[PDB]
Amino acid sequence: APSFPFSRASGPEPPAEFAKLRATNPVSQVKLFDGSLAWLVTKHKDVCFVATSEKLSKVRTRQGFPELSASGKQAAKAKPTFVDMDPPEHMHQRSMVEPTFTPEAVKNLQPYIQRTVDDLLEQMKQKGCANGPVDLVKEFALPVPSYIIYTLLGVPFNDLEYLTQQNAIRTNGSSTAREASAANQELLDYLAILVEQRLVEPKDDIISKLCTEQVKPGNIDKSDAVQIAFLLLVAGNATMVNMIALGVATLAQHPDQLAQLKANPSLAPQFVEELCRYHTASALAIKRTAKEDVMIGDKLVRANEGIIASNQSANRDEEVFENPDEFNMNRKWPPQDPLGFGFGDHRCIAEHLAKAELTTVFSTLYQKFPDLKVAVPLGKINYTPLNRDVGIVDLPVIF
Ligand code: HEM
């Protein structure tokens, strides 16, 4: 059984194993870091089954849960938030914060999203690139989702820049463990204090809604509110940063499609849909353990055996998406959903917010900077390490 996670075939490409497994052995066993075996599911139809089957559990203290690293094994010990819950606990807690992320709520946020993107682009323009390329990640891709989610949570404007840097330090590949866990503690301590404050004078933010509607009535206590706030911050931010940078890089690699977006910014939504299928930047979140024996394809998955469902592989599934390895924002979409945001009850709470952020970015960026160019040869883009989710560490641009 091969070791899993697999390595990406190159900087921007999924692991090569997935295409072979889809063709010859679509439900197979893999070996995890601790020697245990897990089932790997690779076809779109089977990923959807794993994401919705009531015989499968997300509870991480169940025997067989497929932790992929040593830190996940010990993180399993903490009191769970709704990301690690089964029904009915899952939606009981998820519904406490879902109101901010509905399509109606995200529609009302759209002027604020546009203003955030506008302001940060104008700052980048004023900084200029007269003294060399600027890092699109540091200058734009990082602050855009960071400022927005921090602001929704209730962080005051003056604290955004420091806290944006701390959260980046958490996930930066060159941070030592001491740097990353210090940045983590910094974030937790700040949120605890913000929860204390909002308990005394609520404002109009997510933390205030939790304090008023759930902590004070006694449905949760303030430490749960901290954990939930922390989950909403760290679950998708690094992914958002990577998607923005990957979109720029992808467009530099497909000049004809960038020219179409320049001449018709209304194609941004279609570009975003294809971006999220092609570059599946969160590919290791759909994991389960079997509560009962369950049959998947031609395999029997025994109770207490772990399952990993690759939505990255599903998004390249030849049986669903014609020419899946071509990036084509003009593709015709089948009836099946792309699975960039997962599937079923656990499907990304922030799907609509994420798409609205991405859509706002790519309908504005090249109107503001029509001559935006990646400043290094495309073969020299600094992608994330091949053993991690696809992403871009830094992206020097001129404009
Ligand atoms: C392009 C950006 C993003 C992508 C591709 C993405 C992707 C995903 C995926 C694949 C999952 C697993 C869903 C499943 O288990 O089926 C997920 C879950 C989740 N994501 Fe995101 N995400 C993004 C942005 C965000 C943002 C901005 C936030 C928070 C503001 C967020 C918060 C969450 C949470 C809380 C969950 C767990 C939901 C649950 O288990 O009920 N994500 N996301």
Please name the residues in contact with 161: beta carbons below 8 A apart, sequence gap of 6 or more: 143
CA 39, CA 289: separation in Å to the nearest integer? Answer: 10
Substitution site in 84, 207, 348, 353 for ligand 1 pocket (most atoms within 8 Å of beta carbon): 348
- Contact 72/36 with Cβ under 8 angstroms? no
**Which residues make beta-bridge pairs with 37?**
31
**Angle at 121 (CA atoms; ends 119, 126), nearest 5 degrees:** 95
**Which tokens hold the place of 98?**
């879902």
Report the largest interatomic distance among the alpha carbons of the chain, rounded to a whole angstrom.
63
**Angle at 123 (CA atoms; ends 120, 126), nearest 5 degrees:** 155
- Contact 350/340 with Cβ under 8 angstroms? no
CA 210, CA 226: separation in Å to the nearest integer? Answer: 10
CA 320, CA 14: separation in Å to the nearest integer? Answer: 17
CA of 164 to the centre of ligand 1 (A): 19
> What phi and psi, each to the nearest 5 degrees, are found at residue 361?
-60, -50
Dihedral angle of Cα 235, 236, 238, 243, to the nearest 10 degrees: 160
Picking from 137, 19, 15, 17, the residue whose alpha carbon sits closest to that of residue 386 is 15
**Which tokens hold the place of 148?**
């927005």
**Angle at 94 (CA atoms; ends 147, 213), nearest 5 degrees:** 80
Please name the residues in contact with 150: beta carbons below 8 A apart, sequence gap of 6 or more: 159, 160, 163, 164, 233
Q: Ligand 1, residue 237: give the atom nearest the CA.
A: 27
> What phi and psi, each to the nearest 5 degrees, are found at residue 5?
-55, 145
CA 15, CA 40: separation in Å to the nearest integer? Answer: 13
Q: Is 388 exposed, middle or buried (0-12, 13-18, 19+ CB in 10 A)?
A: middle
Residue 4 belongs to what domain range?
1-399
CA 323, CA 328: separation in Å to the nearest integer? Answer: 9
Contacts 24+ apart (CB under 8 A), 171-176: 171/238, 173/384, 173/385, 173/388, 173/393
CA 342, CA 7: separation in Å to the nearest integer? Answer: 21
Which CATH number goes with the domain that contains 272?
1.10.630.10
User: Which residue, judged by its Cα, is nearest atom 16 of ligand 1?
Assistant: 342
Amino acid type, 309? A
User: Which residue, judged by its Cα, is nearest atom 2 of ligand 1?
Assistant: 240
Q: Does an H or E element contain 45, and which?
A: helix 44-52
User: Which residue, judged by its Cα, is nearest atom 8 of ligand 1?
Assistant: 341
Picking from 244, 274, 259, 234, the residue whose alpha carbon sits closest to that of residue 360 is 244
Active-site hit among 164, 276, 348, 363: 348
Is 276 annotated in some ligand binding site?
no
**Angle at 281 (CA atoms; ends 279, 284), nearest 5 degrees:** 125
SS3 55: coil
SS3 3: strand
Ligand 1 neighbours (beta carbon < 6 A): 51, 82-83, 94, 149, 231-232, 235-236, 239-240, 243, 276, 281-282, 285-286, 311, 340-344, 346-350, 353-354
CA 273 centroid distance within chain = 14
- Contact 309/47 with Cβ under 8 angstroms? yes
The structural domain count of the chain equals 1
**Which tokens hold the place of 78?**
């903490």
Amino acid type, 110? Q
Amino acid type, 26? P
- Contact 136/369 with Cβ under 8 angstroms? no
User: Which residue, judged by its Cα, is nearest atom 18 of ligand 1?
Assistant: 348
Q: Ligand 1, residue 85: give the atom nearest the CA.
A: 40
Q: Where are the alpha helices (DSSP H) in 158-254?
A: 160-171, 177-200, 206-210, 222-234, 237-253
Q: Does an H or E element contain 255, and which?
A: helix 255-263
Cis peptide before 88 (omega within 30 of 0): yes
Experimental method for this entry? Answer: X-ray
CA 291, CA 55: separation in Å to the nearest integer? Answer: 5
Residue 304, Ramachandran bin (φ over 0: left; ψ between -120 and 50: alpha; else beta)? left
* DSSP secondary structure of 356-399: HHHHHHHHHHHHH-TT-EESS-GGG-EEPPTTS-S-EEE-EEE-
Q: Is 160 exposed, middle or buried (0-12, 13-18, 19+ CB in 10 A)?
A: middle
CA 251, CA 220: separation in Å to the nearest integer? Answer: 45
Q: Is 389 a catalytic residue?
A: yes
**Which tokens hold the place of 333?**
């979409």
CA 331, CA 254: separation in Å to the nearest integer? Answer: 14
Q: In the chain, which ranges are E strands?
A: 27-31, 37-41, 56-57, 134-135, 287-290, 294-296, 299-301, 306-309, 373-374, 382-383, 392-394, 396-398
> What phi and psi, each to the nearest 5 degrees, are found at residue 310?
-85, 105
Q: Does an H or E element contain 272, and which?
A: helix 268-278
Active-site hit among 53, 146, 239, 250: 239
Q: Is 348 a catalytic residue?
A: yes
